[PDB]
Amino acid sequence: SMSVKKPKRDDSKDLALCSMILTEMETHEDAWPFLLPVNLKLVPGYKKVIKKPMDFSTIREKLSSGQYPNLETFALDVRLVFDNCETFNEDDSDIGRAGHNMRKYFEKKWTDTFK
């Protein structure tokens, strides 16, 4: 509360480390469904159903331009990519499987780097 603070967690490396995690996600073989924004002209249903589209390129731009205030807002956008994928794709599809794999991969790197 006022004039009463928990000890300062060092956050000075967070930007660099989120950038490393994102690089690893970008270079995974199963990243291909997530590298670019879904083309809303060419994919029926996407625009109406997926209220907040997110992809890796868009995360990378946000990251590089100071649009994440902290490491939790970065993790929210990454999870959004996988939650959108589950909303629109069958579990038993190549894209559906890709999204499960990528989410598992991300969650391990996140825990190992920060928890």
Short mmCIF file of C-alpha atoms in Angstrom, two decimals:
data_model
loop_
_atom_site.label_atom_id
_atom_site.label_comp_id
_atom_site.label_asym_id
_atom_site.label_seq_id
_atom_site.Cartn_x
_atom_site.Cartn_y
_atom_site.Cartn_z
CA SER A 1 0.00 0.00 0.00
CA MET A 2 1.15 3.64 0.36
CA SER A 3 4.86 3.75 1.36
CA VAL A 4 4.79 -0.13 1.88
CA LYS A 5 6.37 -2.16 -0.96
CA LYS A 6 7.32 -5.79 -1.62
CA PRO A 7 11.01 -6.25 -2.54
CA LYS A 8 11.93 -5.21 -6.18
CA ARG A 9 11.97 -8.30 -8.59
CA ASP A 10 14.67 -7.49 -11.21
CA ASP A 11 12.80 -7.07 -14.51
CA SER A 12 15.59 -5.43 -16.53
CA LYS A 13 16.23 -8.56 -18.64
CA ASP A 14 12.54 -9.39 -19.33
CA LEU A 15 12.47 -7.70 -22.81
CA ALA A 16 15.50 -9.62 -23.96
CA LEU A 17 14.34 -12.91 -22.58
CA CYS A 18 10.74 -12.59 -24.05
CA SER A 19 12.50 -11.80 -27.41
CA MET A 20 14.53 -15.05 -27.07
CA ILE A 21 11.45 -17.12 -26.26
CA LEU A 22 9.65 -15.56 -29.29
CA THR A 23 12.66 -16.41 -31.52
CA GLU A 24 12.45 -20.01 -30.42
CA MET A 25 8.70 -20.10 -31.12
CA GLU A 26 9.25 -18.46 -34.59
CA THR A 27 11.81 -21.14 -35.57
CA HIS A 28 9.83 -24.24 -34.32
CA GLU A 29 8.80 -26.47 -37.29
CA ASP A 30 5.18 -26.34 -36.17
CA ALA A 31 5.06 -22.50 -36.09
CA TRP A 32 3.79 -22.22 -39.74
CA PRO A 33 0.07 -21.67 -38.88
CA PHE A 34 1.01 -18.78 -36.55
CA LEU A 35 3.75 -16.78 -38.32
CA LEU A 36 1.40 -14.28 -40.00
CA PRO A 37 -2.10 -12.90 -39.48
CA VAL A 38 -4.92 -15.09 -40.77
CA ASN A 39 -6.11 -13.54 -44.03
CA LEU A 40 -9.59 -12.25 -43.13
CA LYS A 41 -10.58 -11.90 -46.81
CA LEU A 42 -9.72 -15.50 -47.68
CA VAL A 43 -10.85 -17.47 -44.58
CA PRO A 44 -14.58 -17.61 -44.18
CA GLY A 45 -15.84 -17.31 -40.64
CA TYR A 46 -12.58 -15.98 -39.10
CA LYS A 47 -13.40 -12.34 -38.93
CA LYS A 48 -16.76 -12.86 -37.18
CA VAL A 49 -15.84 -15.68 -34.91
CA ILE A 50 -12.32 -14.66 -33.68
CA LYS A 51 -12.82 -11.39 -31.88
CA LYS A 52 -9.13 -10.74 -31.20
CA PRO A 53 -6.82 -12.16 -33.86
CA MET A 54 -3.16 -12.63 -32.81
CA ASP A 55 -0.06 -14.07 -34.50
CA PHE A 56 3.73 -14.21 -33.96
CA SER A 57 4.61 -11.35 -36.38
CA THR A 58 2.17 -9.05 -34.65
CA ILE A 59 3.61 -10.03 -31.20
CA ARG A 60 7.13 -9.36 -32.59
CA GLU A 61 6.14 -5.86 -33.77
CA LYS A 62 4.38 -5.07 -30.47
CA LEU A 63 7.49 -6.29 -28.57
CA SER A 64 9.95 -4.28 -30.67
CA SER A 65 7.93 -1.03 -30.33
CA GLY A 66 7.31 -0.95 -26.50
CA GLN A 67 3.72 -1.98 -26.69
CA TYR A 68 4.00 -4.63 -23.86
CA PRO A 69 3.98 -2.93 -20.41
CA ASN A 70 5.15 -6.09 -18.69
CA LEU A 71 5.96 -9.81 -19.21
CA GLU A 72 2.32 -10.88 -18.33
CA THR A 73 0.79 -8.86 -21.17
CA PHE A 74 3.33 -10.61 -23.56
CA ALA A 75 2.23 -14.09 -22.22
CA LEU A 76 -1.45 -13.12 -22.69
CA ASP A 77 -0.93 -12.44 -26.45
CA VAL A 78 1.08 -15.66 -26.93
CA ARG A 79 -1.73 -17.72 -25.20
CA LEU A 80 -4.32 -15.83 -27.38
CA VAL A 81 -2.66 -17.26 -30.47
CA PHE A 82 -3.31 -20.81 -29.12
CA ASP A 83 -6.77 -20.14 -27.75
CA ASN A 84 -7.84 -18.72 -31.11
CA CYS A 85 -6.39 -21.80 -32.83
CA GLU A 86 -8.45 -24.16 -30.54
CA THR A 87 -11.59 -22.04 -31.15
CA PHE A 88 -11.38 -22.42 -34.93
CA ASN A 89 -9.60 -25.76 -35.58
CA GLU A 90 -10.44 -29.38 -34.80
CA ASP A 91 -7.99 -31.07 -32.28
CA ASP A 92 -7.50 -33.85 -34.90
CA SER A 93 -6.19 -31.60 -37.74
CA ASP A 94 -2.65 -30.62 -38.58
CA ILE A 95 -3.23 -27.03 -37.42
CA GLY A 96 -5.07 -28.18 -34.27
CA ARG A 97 -2.13 -30.45 -33.31
CA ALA A 98 0.39 -27.70 -34.16
CA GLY A 99 -1.38 -25.41 -31.71
CA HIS A 100 -1.31 -27.93 -28.89
CA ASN A 101 2.39 -28.65 -29.50
CA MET A 102 3.32 -24.95 -29.63
CA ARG A 103 1.44 -24.13 -26.48
CA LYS A 104 3.23 -26.95 -24.59
CA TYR A 105 6.55 -25.76 -25.93
CA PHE A 106 5.85 -22.14 -24.92
CA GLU A 107 4.65 -23.01 -21.39
CA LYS A 108 7.81 -24.97 -20.60
CA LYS A 109 10.11 -22.16 -21.81
CA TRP A 110 8.06 -19.68 -19.76
CA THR A 111 8.34 -21.72 -16.52
CA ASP A 112 12.00 -22.45 -17.05
CA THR A 113 12.92 -18.85 -17.76
CA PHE A 114 10.78 -16.99 -15.18
CA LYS A 115 9.34 -19.42 -12.42
#
